[PDB]
Amino acid sequence: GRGWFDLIDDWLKRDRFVFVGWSGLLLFPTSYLSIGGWFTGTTFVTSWYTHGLASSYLEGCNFFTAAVSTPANSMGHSLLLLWGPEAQGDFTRWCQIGGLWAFCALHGSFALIGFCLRQFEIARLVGIRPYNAIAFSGPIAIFVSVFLMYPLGQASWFFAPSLGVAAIFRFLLFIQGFHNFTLNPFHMMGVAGILGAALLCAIHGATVQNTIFEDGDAANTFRAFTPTQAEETYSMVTANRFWSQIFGVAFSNKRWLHFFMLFVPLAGLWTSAIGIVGLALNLRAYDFVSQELRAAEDPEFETFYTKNILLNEGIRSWMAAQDQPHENFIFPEEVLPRGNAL
Amino acid sequence: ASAWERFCSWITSTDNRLYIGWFGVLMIPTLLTATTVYIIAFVAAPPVDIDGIREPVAGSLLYGNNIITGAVIPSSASIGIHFYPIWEAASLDEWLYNGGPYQLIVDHFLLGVCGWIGREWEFSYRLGMRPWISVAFTAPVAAASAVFLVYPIGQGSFSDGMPLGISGTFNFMLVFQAEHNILMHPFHQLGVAGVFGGSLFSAMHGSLVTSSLIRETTENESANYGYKFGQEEETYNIVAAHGYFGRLIFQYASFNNSRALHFFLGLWPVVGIWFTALGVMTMAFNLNGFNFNQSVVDSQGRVINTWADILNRANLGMEVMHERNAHNFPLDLA
Amino acid sequence: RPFSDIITSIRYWIIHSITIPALYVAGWLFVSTGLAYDIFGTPRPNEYFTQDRQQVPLVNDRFSAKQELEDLTKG
Amino acid sequence: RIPLWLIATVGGTLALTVVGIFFYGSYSGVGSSL
């Protein structure tokens, strides 16, 4: 406590309303600089000079169509430092080349780092096992793979997910049309993890709320629990019987149940991260070659896979001109892939 | 002491390995029929003229599909939502030509999952446990009825229901987005919030329960064996997890009550999936997601694009390329 | 002290009958003055296009980006 | 000294008014197709 480092450590780890910790020296600035940056970029900054779009409430957009659009494609993978050779210290030109996206993303990466360090620090000081910091590794993997490694494998930051709602929907459909990411088995494992985690959440909540022990005489049973009680508030045996005789199998071990609840979403996120890392290099599970050859030689062979491939071609051709204005794609109506009538 | 009484006791018996009950009386035959016909049609079934234009689509493994591309194709658009059992076909071959197995499987499966809801209620009553696990199950079932039944009813064709395959599921997604803009529809956004929050709260709850496990295990032994099935004591310190999560964000956010915590866990995904199932049910009758296309114009009045417009371009590509040979008129009113 | 204990205090509201509306109006004059369009470079409703610039403006070089930005934003 | 129910009432009323002004701006002026 006497030493200066000990004094700083004592103050940082003080038990107050907002725990600061040493990690707070990395979290609170960057996180703040991220969030306000988004609130700045989605409120005043435009995408007119990078995407040809309006992306601010000032330009007229709403919560859906407002976004912090990615930098211009000509920027490549520049760090887009405000003092860098692109903006050269000019705030206005920096915002106009979409450098605010680089600001938000690079500060958000370190904000995620600081928050995981915060989880580790609070787990250490409180004295519990650090399983919450390792479950946030899933979200960290998602952010790193989708916002950093994907554009770094592509031509520029331009193809990163623009920070918005409609921007993210455009990213979803762009990735589907150009990579066919639904066919990617790693995406399949990820959506399996997500939907299974939601399933586990719902079933666990219902089962626990519906095998509660009668610890009161009130019809509303929330007040019949004490935080410090050393008694389980619901019947594990009754829930096990219910799910065993309804579904054939059932959890018998609470610790296994709660580790499973952790493992499913985290495994899903990491699996889908592998798929997006694959998509960064255009290593895409785009096609099944056997069916492509059969449909090439058999013009009566049709599958839902081939219909999806045609839809992807439609997405690419009808989206490229307005989605990649830097390419200057002029596709006449003759060459655009169409169908009869509509 | 009567034959009917003994039969009712056996059906409602808590001694069978798998509980049957009266809802199981309807569930087991229907679900078994649906399983049998689905397996048989997925491994081997002739191509189906889904669009009613005499262009059969292959969905069976024997006809050159894999597990990813295989499907039980939706019914023919010529049928519409007319009931198409086997006995309403001139022959079984032409029953398979127009995708009757899809109608059979979908009807039996929907009845079976309704029976599953009721059977979940029933066992709970026999158990003496509180009801409502059944209510949670409804949200998954509601979505299944929305995609398999309500969307054909609104659009007027069983060809429009989701195919019983993986690639066909993606096809149904892309066509739904092209025709309805489901992503911008707020109920689907609530469903996305529901599933993402379900994953978040599942990971969080599992992490905090696993993190504060009471020491009941040696170092050369799995920590899970520190819990004995049917024990009376809690297997982890709720106070430790609650305090850690309070320090992590702020004290007021944490659920100090465990029952409220688990109610919230059961509530968030169930309500989210209810909302997205209802959203699909409403877009069945063509109440589409938001259309902010050309919503920003300059002082002259020319359109400055937004992300909604760029999303519209993808929707338009999918719209023009879907069912290339089925449409003879410019509007996709059907 | 607890949140509700502060909110119901009269002093809180003697402070925030004046402090909060001041900045709520400061934002109003921030944008109504047109100052946001100048700090952040956002075109006004009458600045997306101009003579010889009836097409979308795009930066096509990394290092001369400022130069062509002035050139395009000469106005 | 001020009952917190009245504070909550007035604050929620004002917040709903602000969101409704946002909704009106959504049906009027810039950002509206008209």
């Binding site: 107050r16 309303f17 907002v18 600061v20 703040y32 306000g36 609130f39 409120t43 409430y57 000032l58 007229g60 | 114009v297 300059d298 002082s299 | 909060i20 900045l23 709520y24 109006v25 400061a26 934002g27 109003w28 921030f30 944008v31 109504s32 946001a36 409703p45 | 602000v18 002004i21 946002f22 009106y24 701006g25 009027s28 002026g29 810039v30």
Partner: peptide, 29 residues
């Protein structure tokens, strides 16, 4: 002042941006 700093760092930009947004509703093209 750390409580003041945190709560007001959250609040002051929030009210400033909300005033700007409520003004921005009236830009009227």
């Amino acid at each position: 002042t750390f409580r003041w700093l945190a709560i007001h760092g959250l609040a002051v930009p929030t009210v400033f941006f909300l005033g700007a947004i409520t003004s921005m509703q009236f830009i009227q093209r």
